[PDB]
Scaffold this motif. Structure first.
Motif, PDB file in Angstrom:
ATOM      1  N   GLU A 123      22.573 -26.162  23.514  1.00 40.17           N
ATOM      2  CA  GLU A 123      23.536 -26.183  22.914  1.00 40.17           C
ATOM      3  C   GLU A 123      24.082 -28.025  23.001  1.00 40.17           C
ATOM      4  OE1 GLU A 123      25.768 -22.461  25.186  1.00 40.17           O
ATOM      5  OE2 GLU A 123      25.681 -24.538  25.916  1.00 40.17           O
ATOM      6  N   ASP A 147      21.906 -23.982  27.636  1.00 43.31           N
ATOM      7  CA  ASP A 147      22.963 -25.319  27.588  1.00 43.31           C
ATOM      8  C   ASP A 147      22.231 -26.591  27.258  1.00 43.31           C
ATOM      9  OD1 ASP A 147      25.510 -26.881  28.604  1.00 43.31           O
ATOM     10  OD2 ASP A 147      23.842 -27.787  29.761  1.00 43.31           O
ATOM     11  N   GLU A 177      33.574 -25.816  26.038  1.00 42.66           N
ATOM     12  CA  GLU A 177      33.425 -25.995  27.441  1.00 42.66           C
ATOM     13  C   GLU A 177      33.458 -27.405  27.870  1.00 42.66           C
ATOM     14  OE1 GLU A 177      30.400 -22.211  27.264  1.00 42.66           O
ATOM     15  OE2 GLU A 177      29.799 -24.212  27.519  1.00 42.66           O
ATOM     16  N   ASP A 195      30.006 -24.382  23.442  1.00 41.76           N
ATOM     17  CA  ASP A 195      29.893 -25.554  23.977  1.00 41.76           C
ATOM     18  C   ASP A 195      31.008 -26.699  23.903  1.00 41.76           C
ATOM     19  OD1 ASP A 195      27.854 -27.153  25.897  1.00 41.76           O
ATOM     20  OD2 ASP A 195      28.035 -28.315  24.094  1.00 41.76           O
TER      21      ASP A 195
HETATM   22 MG   LIG Z   1      27.359 -25.308  27.862  1.00 44.00          MG
END
Ligand SMILES: [Mg+2]
Ligand SMILES: [Mg+2]
Ligand SMILES: [Mg+2]
Ligand SMILES: [Mg+2]
Ligand SMILES: [Mg+2]
Ligand SMILES: [Mg+2]
Ligand SMILES: [Mg+2]
Ligand SMILES: [Mg+2]
Ligand SMILES: [Mg+2]
Ligand SMILES: [Mg+2]
Ligand SMILES: [Mg+2]
Lengths: 166, 166, 166, 166
Positions: free
Chosen positions: D126, D123, C126, C123
């Motif tokens: 994260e 997400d 990203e 992450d």
């Molecule tokens: Mg992510």
């Protein structure tokens, strides 16, 4: 007889008087160039103002050297300022040629100070003049290159414009 | 072929390219040192930031010399930046050793300018670099002395702290 | 032995050290491009500043990864920064090519994090890198396309002036 | 039956309820540590405030997960908050140990989201948790290392005073 004068050779005094004359003569060529691009038929007002402001600053350089001559206890001696003579590119190449000539004369002035063991004059020339001189030459060299790149006509006018808003 | 270049020996151009490489390499060692004292196990964030800011300024020095190389009409040539390798005292003594190495290289650059009768470069090195260089060395020498005096442990941490709020 | 290190594979630590090397090398090529268009003969100061600031931000990417390596309890390892090599179109295509190889390396780093079940690093790549990378590539791709459209000469100079005030 | 619930597995709902319990328990240990260093005989008020505010922020983590459970249409289930147990070095190592077990639980929650094809929850963990968790661990690891360096007595008190104004 000078009250201030100390470690100030007559060679150095003479070199400053010669450099004063160089700055006046270069100031005069820049006024010629201003007078040219300010013509109704030429109308490149960006180059006219740049050359006009360049003329004030060459005369300010002459004043600084007069002021320095007197600081050192030397005496100012003034000589005649001789008359000067794509146009945009040619004028910039002329201006570049003049800054390098001024540079060459300033290095000779520096050499006179070196040879006469006059370190304050040498540091004056190298601090107050030689450093702006190389910055001015590069700036004018870039103008030459940009005028080569834009080409004649529309690009010259665009680069002039540009100078005018700078 | 350079429009600006004048009284600029290829020795001088080459010395500047070498000094550019020295500043990059010293900037890289300072980033290594930052990378070290920023470790979780080391946690000397004062030295980490001081070495990190010292790395930005060595890279700014390299930029200034690139900018100066081009002002003079020389051409920049870039070489490989070699990898670098109490810890606080050892790192400061390493940093002192690097500032003196940079100083020694800058004096050689100055000598090249002397020998090639390039006074603006000589005044550039002595005005824009040699003066900060002796101020930096003294500052780092004082850090070395203060780290010797505080001793290991609590005094090192205290001096780091200190650096962090400075 | 690291106090912080948790779920941080030696592959991930090693991949970050390689990406640190990539960002330094791209930063170095951008400084090369800066040094070129800053030449007196080239005088495309808009591209020189754009490449100079691009160089600053690649070095800041390297610093963030060092900072991230240490956050994760890994150990930074530095490798040599190898020396780099219409000019305007060619340099922008070179810059586009470097952003894409940087992107390709970043995706491999992301893959290493995927395979080592390292979702925080995945992450991070990203969120802090892959999103800017893709925006940078588009921006540079747009610059490539605009330099093709304006053509050589006057259009290149015009586009450069746009960059300089943008 | 939830109006909002979509692609939200009972495993994910259950994993969030367990992580809610973990954050409450870590919040409780931090309040224990606050209560200890706030003792008249211990009087390390910098650590007391740091543990007190650490307790506040673990409880805020629990609230965010409740808020997230309800956003996803799941149902919050609360379990008992079990009672918790150089002192300064020992407590910081205990705190480092709690952040890492919190991290380990968060990664298991992330795994549950990966396996149940729940990319929004993945997400979330994260982005809202795993990134702070890794920064918190490094910060606490740095505190561990600084307390080892300063030694017992005067250095511990000095480090505590630093926390109190930081
Ligand atoms: Mg992510
Ligand atoms: Mg002049
Ligand atoms: Mg001038
Ligand atoms: Mg330096
Ligand atoms: Mg320095
Ligand atoms: Mg492996
Ligand atoms: Mg990058
Ligand atoms: Mg980029
Ligand atoms: Mg299941
Ligand atoms: Mg938490
Ligand atoms: Mg925490």
């Amino acid at each position: 007889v000078s009250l201030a004068r100390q470690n100030y050779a007559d060679d150095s005094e003479s070199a400053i008087n010669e450099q004063i004359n160089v700055e006046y003569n270069v100031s005069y060529v820049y006024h010629a160039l201003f007078a040219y691009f300010d013509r109704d038929n030429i109308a490149l007002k960006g180059l006219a103002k740049f050359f006009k402001e360049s003329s004030e600053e060459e005369r300010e350089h002459a004043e600084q050297l007069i002021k320095y001559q007197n600081i050192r206890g030397g005496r100012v001696v003034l000589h005649p300022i001789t008359s000067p003579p794509g146009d945009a590119l040619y004028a910039m190449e002329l201006a570049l040629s003049l800054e390098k000539l001024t540079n060459e004369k300033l290095l000779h002035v520096h050499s006179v100070a070196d040879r006469n063991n006059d370190p304050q004059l040498a540091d004056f020339i190298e601090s107050e003049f030689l450093y702006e001189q190389v910055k001015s030459i590069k700036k004018i060299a870039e103008y030459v290159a940009q005028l080569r790149l834009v080409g004649k006509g529309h690009g010259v006018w665009h680069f002039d414009q540009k100078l005018l808003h700078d």
